[PDB]
Ligand binder design. Structure first.
Ligand SMILES: NC(=O)C1=CN([C@@H]2O[C@H](COP(=O)(O)OP(=O)(O)OC[C@H]3O[C@@H](n4cnc5c(N)ncnc54)[C@H](OP(=O)(O)O)[C@@H]3O)[C@@H](O)[C@H]2O)C=CC1
Ligand SMILES: NC(=O)C1=CN([C@@H]2O[C@H](COP(=O)(O)OP(=O)(O)OC[C@H]3O[C@@H](n4cnc5c(N)ncnc54)[C@H](OP(=O)(O)O)[C@@H]3O)[C@@H](O)[C@H]2O)C=CC1
Ligand SMILES: O=C([O-])C(=O)[O-]
Ligand SMILES: O=C([O-])C(=O)[O-]
Ligand SMILES: [Cl-]
Ligand SMILES: [Cl-]
Ligand code: NA
Ligand code: NA
Lengths: 317, 317
């Protein structure tokens, strides 16, 4: 039985299913200091969260890293590729769930539904009367999707049914769709009043949503981030909200989770979520299955199910 | 200049625009006791909320009641019709807004987004870690719309883009659509796991969502009510939630607003809103304009813009 390392916390379904083919090796944190000599025969890793290079490089027989999540920025895929290690992620099985969350977050941001529920639950409906009217609405908005991949397209399909205009920005256009392409992010931001962020966290997207993009978005502007916190210049966002440069924001992800700047907590026009876009039992069960099924496919057939683009590898044993 | 009575609270936009053609007469509550002899020449009423018959019958020259809202169950339309009084409502201008709110409420009910935001805002992400996974999801659900009118159809169009099956129950089928018709409410409830209520509050819908309907909905069942509180047997709903007969509920409307039963507040699988489905500035401005424009059309041309079905009347002066 190949030996699979699981560092730190992971969905119990992964742990439950690894014994179908594997011996499991557990360490308490993703930390190379916890690796003992008896673990040097480990052939695979299943991981949720960051995988530091020193931990990855502690295993000379490592063949595969199975990442829990579609984003795999916590894995140094360049180093994995240089070592001939395949990296797998969990695309597709979470696409519709994340797109649902994005829409919920957008509606909560615009219509203040969480605050309205608080008003009721605190007894204010009885004592004070109606919750104040929301200054914003989805009606009449124009939405720009930064990213139009698996998840961005699913978000766009939803938004088509809400009667809003849709535009998008990607490095390469996706022709065949009826959406307006913008070759620059700032150009799209100028044209739209609602910006949805759903790109990976890479060097090319680092602080792409900056002061210039937020200024272009404009005074009716609403920012929704369901991608990675790294993509938004978080200090610039706080400034834009403070000054009324933009009208609101809804964020599922942040620069340094679980820490959220105190200033972001003060704004009554901001909705905040603790990175919950895929966080249902059914979707996390599906993600768990795909982590395990990648490992099973690799060790049984030599072909993973969902290798990442950077590692189109086949097993050599 | 005709004199228009405004009893109790109304959107200030109504009050701002009435002077274009009318003299306004205000009373503090919708209460016949507040009517003075000098008010007996009043020719119209603009009202948000209930209009008791004794108040309506205090005005012998009354020609028109302009209701703020598409639902007009707070007006005794049978008595208005018997007196030859036209009744107007505010359809269409709120359709897309209410449909938006219904989807937001559904997503908040299923994915616990308001609770997840509370977890973050209370500091729990830091010490306790991730918000627990939501037991429910929209993924794989089958939705039954009780009502498929202006607003029900708008909700269905949205839901088509979320990849869920859609069925509906109305007294008469709407052929031409690709949705499955059910001739009974209980039959639809059997077949679906998600019931969205969007019918008017009438004698025929009074407690239609009862213990039998909730039992048929079943143990994965989610109830969303954005129609009228009268349509749901609220005591039966509390029992069903307590016993695990159904899995969750999201409610914008209640039997005796603003009072919500204490038991409903205790359930962690319930989202509650203070009747906010149309409650944005833009949509309430449009509703205000339609109340005033009905009154202006009536007194200038003798034809209202949006008379109700029960009063297809033309002005006689
Ligand atoms: N909040 C959460 O829980 C979740 C967050 N995520 C995040 O969402 C991301 C996207 O997921 P998914 O849709 O499956 O990924 P895809 O690879 O299918 O799509 C990525 C999109 O981003 C675009 N893109 C990438 N780099 C740039 C760039 N520099 N400038 C402009 N566009 C760029 C791509 O187009 P092109 O290549 O043409 O530029 C493509 O349209 C994940 O990497 C993850 O970080 C996903 C799931 C859960
Ligand atoms: N929470 C909120 O803020 C809002 C609530 N509302 C409520 O929503 C209601 C619906 O508005 P709207 O869609 O514009 O109205 P419509 O008149 O356009 O649609 C009403 C629908 O209900 C159906 N219906 C009526 N009685 C029954 C019955 N006994 N059994 C089955 N179906 C029935 C009708 O079909 P059929 O006649 O064939 O039965 C029709 O499909 C309003 O009356 C109002 O009370 C609306 C807006 C705001
Ligand atoms: O990429 C993911 O799936 C994530 O955000 O966890
Ligand atoms: O019927 C309406 O529009 C309402 O609920 O106010
Ligand atoms: Cl998980
Ligand atoms: Cl109002
Ligand atoms: Na703009
Ligand atoms: Na059922």
């Amino acid at each position: 039985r190949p030996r699979i390392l699981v560092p730190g916390k992971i969905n119990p379904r992964v742990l439950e299913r690894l014994p179908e083919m594997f011996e499991t090796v557990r360490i308490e944190r993703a930390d190379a200091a916890l690796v003992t000599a008896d673990m040097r025969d480990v052939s695979g890793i299943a991981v949720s969260g960051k995988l530091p290079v020193p931990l990855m490089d502690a295993f000379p027989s490592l063949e595969i890293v199975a990442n829990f999540g579609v984003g795999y920025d916590g894995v140094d895929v360049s180093r994995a590729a240089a070592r001939g290690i395949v990296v797998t992620n969990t695309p597709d099985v979470l696409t519709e769930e994340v797109a649902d969350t994005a829409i919920g977050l957008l509606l909560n941001t615009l219509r203040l539904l969480p605050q309205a529920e608080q008003w009721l639950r605190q007894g204010r409906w009885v004592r004070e009367g109606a919750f104040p009217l929301s200054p914003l609405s989805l009606r009449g908005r124009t939405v720009g999707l930064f990213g139009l991949g698996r998840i961005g397209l699913a978000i766009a399909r939803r938004l088509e049914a809400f009667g809003v205009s849709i535009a998008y920005h990607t490095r390469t256009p996706r022709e065949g769709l009826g959406f307006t392409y913008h070759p620059t992010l700032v150009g799209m931001a100028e044209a739209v009043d609602t910006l949805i962020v759903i790109v990976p966290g890479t060097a090319s997207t680092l602080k792409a949503v900056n002061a210039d993009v937020l200024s272009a978005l404009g005074p009716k502007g609403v920012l929704i981030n369901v991608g990675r916190g790294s993509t938004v210049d978080e200090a610039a966002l706080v400034t834009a909200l403070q000054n009324g440069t933009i009208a609101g924001a809804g964020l599922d992800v942040f620069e340094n989770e679980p820490n959220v700047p105190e200033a972001l907590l003060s704004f009554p026009n901001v909705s905040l979520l603790p990175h919950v876009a895929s966080a249902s039992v059914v979707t996390r069960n599906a993600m768990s299955d795909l982590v395990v099924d990648n490992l099973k496919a690799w060790f049984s057939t030599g072909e993973a199910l969902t290798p990442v683009a950077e590692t189109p590898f086949r097993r050599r044993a």
